[PDB]
C-alpha cells in the first residue's frame, strides 16, 4: 500500500535553522518525492488537547474537523512563500503525497506552502 | 570554543513497505531480504516536554506511539519509527540518540521477503 520512494533527499539539521529537507541531486518537475502515512487525531482530542502541544506547529486539517500529523518526511518540509513542493491528501488510505512543482536543483531546500486546504485526491 | 552544529542525514531507502494488518493496524514489511545488523531507518523525533505531555499529550492518541525520553519527555518518531508493530519475538532493535533526538533501527537477524519488521 505504501512502498519506499527512492528520492535523492537528505535532512539538514542545524543549530541555526532546525531541520529541513534538501535535494542531493536535480529532481524533475511533478515527481512524487514522499508518501507520508498520517497519524489521525479526532476533532475532540485535538480541540481539547492536541492543539495545546507542539502538534499545533505540524498538523494538517482533515475531514470532519480531524487533524493529521504526517509521519515519514512530511512534517520536515519547511514552509515558504515560493514553495517548490505541493501535496495531496488521501482520505481512503490515510496518507499525504508530496510532489515537486518544478525542477529542483541540487542543494535547494524542498518547501511547501504556508497554507492548508481541505480537499482530497480520492473525492 | 567551537561553532554551531550542522548535520546532513540520509533518508535511508530500505526496501520496506507499509501495509495494513488484521489485528495490529499498519505495519512495516520487507520487500526483499535484508541482512542482520543492517540500519534500516533513522527517525527524527518530535519531542514533547514533560509538562505538555502530562497536561495534554497523554490524553491523545500520541500516547499509543510515543517513546519515553529523559526527564519525563516523550518522543514521537517521525520517519518509519512509529509504524513498527510491537511483538514478543522482535526482529528489529532500536537505539536512541540522546544528543541529537533521533532513533535508529537495525535488523537483529536476516529478514525474509514479506516478513513484518517488529520491535519490542
Curated annotation (Swiss-Prot), chain A:
Keywords assigned by UniProt, alphabetized: Cytoplasm, Methyltransferase, Nucleus, S-adenosyl-L-methionine, Sporulation, Transferase
The answer, when asked if Cytoplasm is one of the entry's keywords, is yes
Full protein: residues contained = 2 to 124 of 147
User: What happens biologically when this protein's gene is inactivated, per the record?
Assistant: Abnormal sporulation resulting in asci with fewer than four spores and with abnormal spore wall morphology.
Provide the protein's localization.
Cytoplasm; Nucleus
Q: What is this protein called?
A: Histone-lysine N-methyltransferase, H3 lysine-37 specific
Q: Where is the SET domain?
A: 7-115
Top enzyme class: transferase
Give the consequence of mutating residue 60 to A. Answer: Severely decreases activity
Gene, per the UniProt record: set7
Q: What is the effect of changing residue 87 to A?
A: Abolishes activity
Q: What functional role does this protein have?
A: Histone lysine methyltransferase that specifically mono-, di-, and trimethylates 'Lys-37' of histone H3 to regulate sporulation.
Q: What is the effect of changing residue 79 to A?
A: Abolishes activity
What the record says about family reads: Belongs to the class V-like SAM-binding methyltransferase superfamily.
